[model samples]
Target chain A: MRKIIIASQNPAKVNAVRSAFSTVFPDQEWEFIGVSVPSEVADQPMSDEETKQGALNRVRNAKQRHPGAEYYVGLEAGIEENKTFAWMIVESDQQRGESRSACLMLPPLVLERLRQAKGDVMDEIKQKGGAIGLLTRHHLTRSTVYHQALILALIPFINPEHYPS
Target chain B: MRKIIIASQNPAKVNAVRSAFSTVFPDQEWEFIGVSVPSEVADQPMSDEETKQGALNRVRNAKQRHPGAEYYVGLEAGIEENKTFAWMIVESDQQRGESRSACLMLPPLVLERLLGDVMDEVENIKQKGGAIGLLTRHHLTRSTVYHQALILALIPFINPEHYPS
Candidate 1:
């Protein structure tokens, strides 16, 4: 059986990773494992470059720990003053497919959580729904928004012929 | 492995059927086969009633052929002078999901073929790069146009939770 490691321990990230690979490679027997790895960046990256590097670094750490795995997936949530987004990366064999989510404007409550990680602001946000859930009034959730990016990142793997070397 | 039966042997309809089933059931094993069946309607259904009935009849015939299979798909092209369209239907275990394609106006050459089956007319149209192909000279093909309808038809299967039981 091939091993597939996800470079995060967040419940939402793990669930999203599992759903995507299972859909893309349903018949194959693959092991699913989630590891807590350091992203080598702030919990909430403030710039686009840092955000992308955070996911790439997490994936590199996952591969270092489990060098024999067939695939490594990384997901990093990023937030800036007016720019809040998530990035998803799937690295397998030698090809790397990456995609980013739609940016959402952060409310004052959510921005406070990112700037100053008191942790209580996040807890309160989730209770009310979520950062995005509250902002979109439950029209969108963190999970759904992140899952769309994951699906997009897997497109190159799904339709390799549609892309070129 | 399960099977999906397509009513017509036309390349466009078969390709559309394959894409929709693969998306809705990516992990499962599916075999797609095309069968030629009479629509029991006019050679070219000219009105909404006739066109829809044609698709219905095709699905019924497909089910009769493969009663043990999981699903049967049908597609009927319609032409009523300026109101030319296509209908797609998918039937399974007494449950039906159906949708129609965006309607396009017909050219004089195409209308002539539908109204009167002339071998030379079809060859003439093909020599001119197909009537539909000529009107939309970009990348849109019959396969892609019908594929949209197939995707629309598969929505009920994709998410049974959103619809009424």
Candidate 2:
């Protein structure tokens, strides 16, 4: 079976990975699995590099735990200044891909709250439809943003001609 | 009447702004207008800050050209290392918001082509369907990504209580 092991148990990330792969490979069946893994970074990544490293680290750890899976995926959300964004990394035996989700400007209060709480605030907001959802009145969700970045990351896998395998 | 002046003649960006504003305010009528403006950055922005600055400059230039619009929107697509991304900025008399589009990794050949044919290759690709469309086989397009980011940027305007006036 085609297996995709996601390195997060969060429903938004899990479902985003599932939806991305299903859309790319519509004709095939897939086995989706979500597992918690350590990002080996700060609880709140403060920059793009740190956030992206968290995603890469998750994929690496996930692959170490579930070596047999066809793909390992990791997702990490972080802040830069007053902006909120996320990174996604997907890896397989032969190829690796990474993408950054759209960045959103955080309200001053929201940014301050995130900086102060430093734990479970983003987690709680994510579960409740995401900061984007809260700000946009549910017009957009974390899953939607993550889904777009995941699909963009998968582009190289599908277009091997120009990708230089 | 609400007037939004978008700083691009490309349908992708113009329509993205139109759709984003309409979605955020479905109950109200809006007059959407598109005008070409200068980003005041390199044709291909190579970093997050450069790309974001381009969007900001575009909005500023648009506002200068058309001084009476209720809103000025700017959209800029750029590359960072080998990744491709975009930025969207929306500004009004009382508020300003910015968002970045999800980043995509470009194939080596596509990157080379872009570097070599610097003049209108990106412009042609964008007009044709966009590099994302070409890379993803049309499942995703430039407009779709820009639309999401534009919507994200408009959050501050809609949620005025939390956003500083």
Candidate 3:
């Protein structure tokens, strides 16, 4: 039972959540909505701690905005040690879950673009074409990474043993 | 709008349809059930015609057993010219759709096993660690190929414009 609000109206992110959540909870019926919310972190988080914070902020903010929803998701991508990673945070009914996607080492070309961009990194790399796309050659996208870890972040809600209540 | 039946109960193939269908038709409320059905052709179809025929047979058979379902899916894996492929066929009220996966060049080792094994090809392939899995080094599975084509087979139903009444 997930009435999901993804804290970014960005189509790429919205689509990723829709796709990922759809896969992880196939037997469950859920509705996904996109809403713009502030991450309340630097537009670009440079380390693991900040990346997680950014994601958490957005998820929290989304919950405030869509309090009726059962789940709120936040995805924040950042760079660390020349690699790219995205943190996914899910908040549902007082239970919090977190997961990060498998990291991809970035190339100089893409890393430079990520560092050089202003505001959203996506404006520079284009939708679904950020460091993730460069590494995957578009076989994967921001949506792919977001979707992958969103599934992970949802695990605590889907099952309680590993993430015991 | 969709109560679906997949002809065979192969987990990989069933998962593929579920995954692919979820991706393509995220907005719909659907239920899926899988059951045993016959191909009425060589268990391992040896030719393109046989593969399609096998897939078609399963769909038609599934429909009778699951008349309440609006759609039935059939996937048949086959070999021709030492290449591996699977045909996915979908049948719905007053309309039908079809798609086939890209073929992989089969290794002689796998080919020999397919021809030599006892019981169904699926059984032999399972023992051989799944034909696509072996060829793709586990990067792909029989379900992956079946799912890939299953999406295509749903195109006609998804967009009635292409195949209108």
Index of the highest-DockQ prediction: 2
Please give the DockQ score of every candidate, comma-separated.
0.02, 0.80, 0.02
Tens-place lDDT digits, model 3, residues B1-165: 568898988776677778877777666788877889888998778987798899999888888877989778887877786555677788887877775554544434446666525224424555343644543333345555455456546655654643454
TM-score of each: 0.48, 0.92, 0.46
Ranking by DockQ: 2, 1, 3
Candidate by candidate, in order, the iRMS in Å equals 14.5, 0.9, 15.5
Worst 10 residues of 3 chain B by lDDT: B115-124
Model 1, span A33-115: residue lDDT tens: 89988999987688867988999999999999888888899998776564467778889867776766545544444465557
DockQ, 0 to 1 scale, candidate 1? 0.02
C-alpha positional error of residue A97 in candidate 2 after TM-score superposition, expressed in Å: 1.0
Highest TM-score scorer: 2
Alpha carbon RMSD to native, model 3: 16.8
Interface RMSD of 1: 14.5
Error of 2 at B83 (Å): 0.9
Each model's Cα RMSD:
16.9, 2.5, 16.8
Q: What is candidate 3's lDDT per residue for A1-165, written digit by digit as tens? A: 557898888888888888776676667778889999888888889887798899898888887878999888888887675555678878877777766664444434445676765424333265545644543435445555455456545655655532443
What docking grade applies to model 3? incorrect
